């Protein structure tokens, strides 16, 4: 029994993490095989933060200008390369931890974990979900740039984000490990907002069903809804449109506990109306988004 | 910027994990040295947990009983020998990816991060807080026995925990490493429950200050008290008393910020006597006690 936010064993990635440097600037890169990734922003000065030319500053580069450092074995670069937002380095040795990997772009309501690092050296690992306005809700100091999101399957590291930026309402943007951001973000200095964000319905649904698996159902009752009159609700509290796909999705869920999914859509919408009257769900007083309906499944039955 | 409750990186853990079957029974082990340490009960049929003779039941066994799998290699088992609650398997190999490690037994309201393990096999890092009560709030289904909890400290892994037992309310209960229970349990299939619980209030207030180092100043109040009348208010509420050491180990984050221990109680005096108002503090709308002073510093400064 017991539900808690977990994150991914961090053992497959703390063996890739390296710190790389360039100039005064020091943040996190990943190795795997011969390549080191980390944020292209790794080559920008004080004056160019805010309209950096990218290709103009990294033609001027030679590879011995970059510093990489494996533990206490620095690593020589041997080529260096842009692709999108992320700078790859070709460096003389392979990774010998490389584990088992993918690199997989996700979507807003995915869930992943984030292994913060310094200097090349892991500090802790959390669990975080992409939200709807594609940024995170993440803990990171200065130099934390190139750590990197990642879910594990099996012995395979799926690695789904790489930090580049805060912003100003304290939240984190980052891209892909093919440098894609995501979102509408740009590494540069320049005003940019997040939108509005707004609660991820179906993890909040999924989340529901984990405590009816759990063995809590105060908050059930006797009403149904149809689709249209759920998302008419929802959207009035800042809750994203529920889709048919996410209907789908929750079909496992509603078959093991024997509560139709628009059945625990019309109990989410008197918990909107009521809030928690002083009580608790799976131990929280506010609706918890942050666990798929994957997620859900694979702590309750292993 | 950003607060979230982080574990510490599991890799130097996961390196230890084996997979421990004594007849039909498998749980985990761990691996240090040329020693697996696992659950004396694992030698137990289920009448024999109803009232075992720990000692009697291990006479009857030998080595070859002990099957000890290393992911995909099979330790031979060499010994056996218990110490308190835990089985002490001696094998054939030391662990090559054993790290500096010691023992420690910690303090109700310390925190460590527990590596759910099912078949020897890693599966998910949490946080946890050792409760008033001595149990903790985990997640574990069946086969998780002998997970085990640690912290770190500067390349040493200190355990401080291994998993044995879940309680009827669905809390859990174990031992250190040394085979001592935290709390008034036993390894039986009897009657037990958790005792009543209180909160952890030195945490609430690290968390407090985690909150104004965040940005989130709102319950901050022009008012200050002493220890005696802030522990009259804690006895009220179930909260653990205040003690002078508390207010030391504070110290710093009362300077960090600029609000001094007892400033920051009569804001948590005002917290517990009115409520939070409908407003949230570092996005819960609980008070949160599973963050020690240290944490708070470690990841808000450190
Ligand atoms: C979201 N997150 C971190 C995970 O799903 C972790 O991965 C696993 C893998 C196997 C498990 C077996 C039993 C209980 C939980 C498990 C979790
Ligand atoms: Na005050």
Chains 1, 2 share one sequence.
Not at 169 to 178: K, M, Q, R, S, W
Not at 219 to 243: G, H, I, Q, S
Not at 289 to 300: A, I, K, L, S
């Amino acid at each position: 029994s017991g539900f808690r936010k977990m994150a991914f064993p961090s053992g497959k990635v703390e063996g890739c993490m390296v710190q790389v440097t360039c100039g005064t600037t020091t943040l996190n890169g990943l190795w795997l095989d011969d390549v080191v990734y980390c944020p292209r922003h790794v080559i920008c000065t004080s004056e160019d933060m805010l309209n950096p030319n990218y290709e103009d500053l990294l033609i001027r580069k030679s590879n011995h200008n970059f510093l990489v450092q494996a533990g206490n074995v620095q690593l020589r670069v041997i080529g260096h390369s842009m692709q999108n937002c992320v700078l790859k380095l070709k460096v003389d040795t392979a990774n010998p931890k490389t584990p088992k990997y993918k690199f997989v772009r996700i979507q807003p309501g995915q869930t992943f974990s984030v292994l913060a690092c310094y200097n090349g050296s892991p500090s802790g690992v959390y669990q975080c979900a992409m939200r709807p306005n594609f940024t995170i809700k993440g803990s990171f100091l200065n130099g934390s740039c190139g750590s990197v999101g990642f879910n594990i399957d099996y012995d395979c590291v799926s690695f789904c984000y790489m930090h580049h930026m805060e912003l100003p309402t304290g939240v984190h943007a980052g891209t892909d490990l093919e440098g894609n951001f995501y979102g509408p973000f740009v590494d540069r200095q320049t005003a940019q907002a997040a939108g509005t964000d707004t609660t991820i319905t179906v993890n909040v649904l999924a989340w529901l069903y984990a405590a009816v698996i759990n063995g809590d159902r105060w908050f059930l009752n006797r009403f149904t809804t149809t689709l249209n009159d759920f998302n008419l609700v929802a959207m009035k509290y800042n809750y994203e449109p529920l889709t048919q796909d996410h209907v789908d999705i929750l079909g496992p869920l509603s078959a093991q506990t024997g509560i139709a999914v628009l059945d625990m859509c019309a109990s989410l919408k008197e918990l909107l109306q009521n809030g928690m009257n002083g009580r608790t769900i799976l131990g929280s007083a506010l609706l918890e988004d942050e666990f798929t309906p994957f997620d859900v499944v694979r702590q309750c039955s292993g």
